[PDB]
């Protein structure tokens, strides 16, 4: 099997691709979330205009148009009421993801923090084995692998 240690660097190398891709995604979420608010604002503003025109309709005794104008506003009132509640509930939708992401970064930095510490410890040992492994060739004659065999000659 492959040395799993080498994969560690590759894994985080591809890790940042997801995190940055995440960062892009969240913005598009609030882009629309706030977009509806403006769209709602326009709609209610139109209703205000219709409401205002009804106020003008009432003036001079032309209440007949105000009924249509107010009656016309009811269409946008329901549309306004529908969207207003959607905006309110979508607030918690963006809260949880914000709560989701905020904890996200604090972990990775510390995860990446301790990554390097133990790589040194590993690379510390690979030297200890090799110096001792080669020290096996240069031994105290317990094995007589290299030097003592020469002393025989």
């Amino acid at each position: 099997q492959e040395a799993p240690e080498d994969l560690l660097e590759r894994l985080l190398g591809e890790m940042e691709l997801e995190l940055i891709e995440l960062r892009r995604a969240l913005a598009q979420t609030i882009a629309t979330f706030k977009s509806t608010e403006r769209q709602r604002d326009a709609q209610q503003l139109i209703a205000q205009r219709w409401y205002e025109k009804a106020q003008a309709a009432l003036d001079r005794g032309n209440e007949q148009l105000a009924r249509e104008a107010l009656g016309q506003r009811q269409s946008y009132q329901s549309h306004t009421e529908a969207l207003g509640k959607s905006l309110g509930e979508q607030r918690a939708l963006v809260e949880q993801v914000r709560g989701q992401l905020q904890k996200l970064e604090r972990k990775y930095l510390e995860l990446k923090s301790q990554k390097n510490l133990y790589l040194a410890r590993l690379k510390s040992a690979i030297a200890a084995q090799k110096i001792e492994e080669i020290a096996g060739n240069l031994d105290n004659a317990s094995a007589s692998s290299l030097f003592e065999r020469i002393e025989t000659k």
Binding site: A54, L58, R67, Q74
Partner: protein, 43 residues
């Protein structure tokens, strides 16, 4: 043509006479309530 419209209303809640009454009545209340504020404000 007709079957597919029925399929739509089948998958729809066809507005019952109650909701038609409620929506009309609340509209009748909405127009009146919206009217009521205006009829009182002008005096």
């Amino acid at each position: 043509i007709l079957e597919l419209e029925a399929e739509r209303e089948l998958l729809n809640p066809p507005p019952s006479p109650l909701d038609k009454k409620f929506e009309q009545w609340e509209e009748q209340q909405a127009v009146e309530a919206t009217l009521a504020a205006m009829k009182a404000r002008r005096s």
